[PDB]
């Protein structure tokens, strides 16, 4: 038979513009808000509205239509839902990148630790390619442990020219698990101060980095901002990406992605209910860590030093990264 | 509103028309695929001006289709509706959900809520008509309508009009 005729012009892909999803875009693209960690209603006859297999995200059955485009399985590309996360979480694939940006900017005003008043940074900013410019900037800024409200002038070092600063000592940032922990070193008069850098705190800082500042770090004003490396709204892939197989067709199985997406929802609702009423900070932090772990393992289940998400049979859950990599992956 | 627009189209020729008179076929295709067609970006393409001097560029053979793709530049008269514009037309259909006014190649739909309060629908009279103390609106009647909204699809345009404002309605 083939696919139906279309009035749209037929074209060839000329360019591919990679980038990061903004939380606003994920909500605008979304056709439905996923709020129930189930797949079928209490009768197990139809898909639950608002659940994982919402009929609005598409159809993977030859006998049902998509509630959005009213087309069969072989024409519906699939439609994305979204889950609004209770608290921001890191992207497991950008934590190292997020850490490097944190060491480059001030963690209280979001300004690059070294301005154009420094000769070495002037050479660094003169590098054309984004990647090596970022490496040069990081090599210079990661050792600057202060914001330097006033900096020596470039005409002579006699008088100081003022620059936007705050004078707060920068911390030494290290990656412990899926958290970023900073340590402040004391003054003349013991053990350094230590506390955890909250994802909300880091998101707030990354939203203050100026356009010219993170373009120097290799980010794009329109397609990739450092603020978007922190996940606030999660895109929910359509069923085509996570189809439900049948072995005897009297038994029903769900994709590993659906299992993890249900975990994210359950962890999300648990965090919402906790922080809504009472919830001493210890309980909240535990819930946030669970939400972070589920999202991280939903995307990549092979993380150094972390536990692995396991099906009830005990085998590792197949993540999106596992599907794209290897001799048998998508590519 | 009627505009004279400079338009471009991509025409496809089946290999059966790769003869010594293929330019004539391209002209025929243009008049058969463009004239009378509706585009949400340019409105209704009504007439092609200077039918003798269309610019036919070199055609590209499609890899697997085998057909030639010609870019064609032409000058056409196109009717494009705009919200907030006032037009005149003739009523073609009447129903409980209001009447429809025919303005050139476009049909404007006037909803009850966009009509004056005094007007009321009377299905008893044949044909059905909207009756008020001063005037009667029926099929073939002439109505001055102000387009209140326009929804343009890639191959269709639908508009809603109103006759509530002054100097509107029956002419």
């Amino acid at each position: 038979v083939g696919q139906q005729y279309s009035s749209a012009p037929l074209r060839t892909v000329k360019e591919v513009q990679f980038g990061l999803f903004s939380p606003e875009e994920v909500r605008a693209i979304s056709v439905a808000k996923i709020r129930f960690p189930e797949t079928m209603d209490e009768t197990q006859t139809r898909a639950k509205i608002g659940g994982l297999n919402d009929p609005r995200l598409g159809s993977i059955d030859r006998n049902l239509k998509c509630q959005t485009c009213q087309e069969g399985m072989n024409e519906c590309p699939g439609h994305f839902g979204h889950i609004d996360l209770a608290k921001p979480v890191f992207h497991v694939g950008f934590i190292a990148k997020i850490k490097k940006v944190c060491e480059c900017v001030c963690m209280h005003c979001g300004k690059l630790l070294l301005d154009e008043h420094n000769e070495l940074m002037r050479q660094a900013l003169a590098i054309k390619d984004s990647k090596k410019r970022f490496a040069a900037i990081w090599t210079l800024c990661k050792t600057k442990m202060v914001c330097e409200t006033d900096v020596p002038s470039e005409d002579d070092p006699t008088q100081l020219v003022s620059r936007g600063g705050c004078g707060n000592t920068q911390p030494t940032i290290r990656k412990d698990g899926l958290k970023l922990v900073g340590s402040w070193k004391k003054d003349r008069a013991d053990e350094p101060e230590l506390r955890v850098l909250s994802t909300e705190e880091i998101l707030n800082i990354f939203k203050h980095i100026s356009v010219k500042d993170f373009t120097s770090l290799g980010f794009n004003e329109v397609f990739s901002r450092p603020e978007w490396m922190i996940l606030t709204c999660l895109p929910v892939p359509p069923p085509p990406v996570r189809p439900s197989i049948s072995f005897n067709e009297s038994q029903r199985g769900e994709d590993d992605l659906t299992f993890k997406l249900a975990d994210i929802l359950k962890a999300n609702i648990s965090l919402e209910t906790l922080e809504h009423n009472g919830a001493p900070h210890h309980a909240i932090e535990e819930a946030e860590s669970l939400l972070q772990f589920h999202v991280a393992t939903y995307m990549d289940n092979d993380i150094a030093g972390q536990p692995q998400a396991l099906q009830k049979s005990g085998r590792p859950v197949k993540s999106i990264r596992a599907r794209l990599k290897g001799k048998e992956g998508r590519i | 509103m009627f505009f004279i627009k400079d338009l471009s189209l991509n025409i496809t020729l089946h290999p059966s028309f790769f003869g010594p008179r293929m330019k004539q076929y391209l002209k025929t295709k243009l008049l058969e695929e463009v004239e009378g067609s509706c585009t949400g970006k340019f409105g209704y393409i009504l007439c092609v001006l200077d039918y003798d001097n269309i610019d036919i560029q070199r055609g590209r053979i499609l890899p697997t289709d085998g057909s030639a793709e010609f870019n064609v530049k032409y000058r056409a008269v196109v009717f494009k509706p705009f919200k907030g514009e006032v037009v005149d037309g003739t009523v073609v259909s009447c129903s409980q959900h209001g009447f429809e006014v025919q303005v050139g190649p476009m049909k404007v739909f006037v909803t009850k809520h966009l009509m004056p309060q005094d007007l009321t629908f009377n299905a008893g009279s044949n044909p059905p008509s909207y009756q008020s103390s001063e005037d009667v609106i029926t099929i073939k009647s002439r109505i001055r309508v102000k387009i209140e909204g326009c929804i343009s699809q890639v191959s269709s345009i639908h508009a809603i009009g109103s006759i509530k404002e002054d100097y509107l309605g029956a002419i």
């Binding site: 990679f18 990739s224 | 590209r60």
Partner: protein
């Protein structure tokens, strides 16, 4: 580059760096299922009206 090794790491860096792929390589066209600009694809085939009129 993602076709050889470190597929996901390369794609994440492409997203964070907002890399533009112009699809001039064989791998990009293979992924997109379109004729690569190689061999029989290193040129375009156009139709000649000037010769069509004189071939009759």
């Amino acid at each position: 580059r993602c076709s050889f090794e470190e597929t996901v790491e390369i794609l994440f860096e492409a997203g964070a760096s907002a890399e533009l792929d112009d699809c001039r390589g064989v791998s990009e066209n293979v992924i997109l299922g379109q004729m690569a600009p190689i061999g029989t694809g290193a040129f375009d085939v156009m139709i000649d009206e000037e010769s069509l009129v004189k071939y009759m």
